[PDB]
């Protein structure tokens, strides 16, 4: 994440680190982020699995705050490590343009939720698309600056602003490349944004009067990182409740949706 500071242990217990496991040397490399939905599913970005669709090219790390580049050493609790049992890229995903960039991963064996690992919430059917203004945060182990080979060993976080799509799409910004299933978040002057390695990660929001945060998007792409008028483009989770529910089950999704509590 370009900008923003490090996070504190337990601050975001649904963060999962998708890694690529080179078998010819047991090295693990963090390449994408992800969101813990339940004991056995993780929501992520589709593009992540490009040229990597074999369930054994991956390893999942939960309950982490500090992530090390290529490492072979096992992970000691509370950190957890897991294997991919399934990779479900969205049926109408479009590579390249990064459309319907959303995927689901089934874990094996399942993870135990504790002080450093628990689910995140998704929007309610009733939600509709993210209305600005609002206070959102993004987290991730990606680059700290456009390019710059090294990723962040310590999970980072940053506060960002939702931008209307009519603005995000205007000529002087993305000039048409944005669609209704997207969500743009960042700043007009940039400086703060996600970046490679953050992909698959969450865009969480809520209102000043509200208690809990909610994953309203998955980091998808953008033009560089932290550039003027080029906000990060995210996959709006709301329009995919639909698909999510058809893969993970109704109740499962129900359990990750806030009710109508006190305001």
């Amino acid at each position: 994440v370009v900008g923003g500071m490090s996070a504190e242990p337990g601050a975001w217990p649904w963060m999962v680190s998708l890694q690529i496991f080179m078998y010819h040397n047991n090295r693990r490399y963090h390449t994408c982020g992800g969101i813990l939905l339940n004991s056995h599913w993780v929501l992520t970005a589709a593009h992540c699995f490009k040229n990597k669709k074999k369930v054994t090219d991956w390893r999942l790390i939960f309950g982490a705050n500090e992530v090390v580049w290529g490492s072979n050493k096992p992970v000691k609790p509370p950190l957890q490590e897991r294997f991919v049992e399934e990779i479900i890229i969205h049926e109408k995903y479009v590579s390249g343009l990064e459309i319907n960039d959303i995927a689901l991963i089934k874990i094996t064996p399942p993870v135990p939720c504790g002080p450093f690992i628990g689910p995140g919430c998704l929007p309610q059917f009733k939600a509709g698309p993210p209305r600005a203004p609002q206070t959102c945060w993004v987290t991730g182990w990606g680059y700290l600056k456009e390019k710059g080979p090294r990723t962040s060993p310590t999970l980072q976080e940053a506060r960002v602003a939702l931008i209307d799509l009519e603005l995000c799409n205007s000529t002087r910004w993305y000039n048409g490349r944005i669609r209704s299933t997207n969500v743009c978040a960042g700043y007009p002057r940039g400086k703060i944004d996600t970046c490679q390695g953050d992909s698959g990660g969450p865009l969480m929001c809520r209102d000043r009067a509200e208690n809990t945060f909610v994953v309203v998007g998955i980091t998808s792409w953008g033009v560089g990182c932290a550039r003027a008028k080029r906000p990060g483009v995210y996959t709006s989770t709301w329009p995919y409740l639909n698909w999510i529910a058809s893969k993970i089950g109704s109740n499962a999704l129900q359990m990750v949706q806030l009710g109508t509590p006190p305001r």
């Binding site: 242990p9 217990p13 004991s39 504790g114 809990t212």
Partner: peptide, 13 residues
């Protein structure tokens, strides 16, 4: 240590 329960819960610590 089920993963059910209220979501969006932070600092479970």
């Amino acid at each position: 240590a089920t993963c059910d329960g209220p979501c969006g819960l932070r600092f479970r610590q």
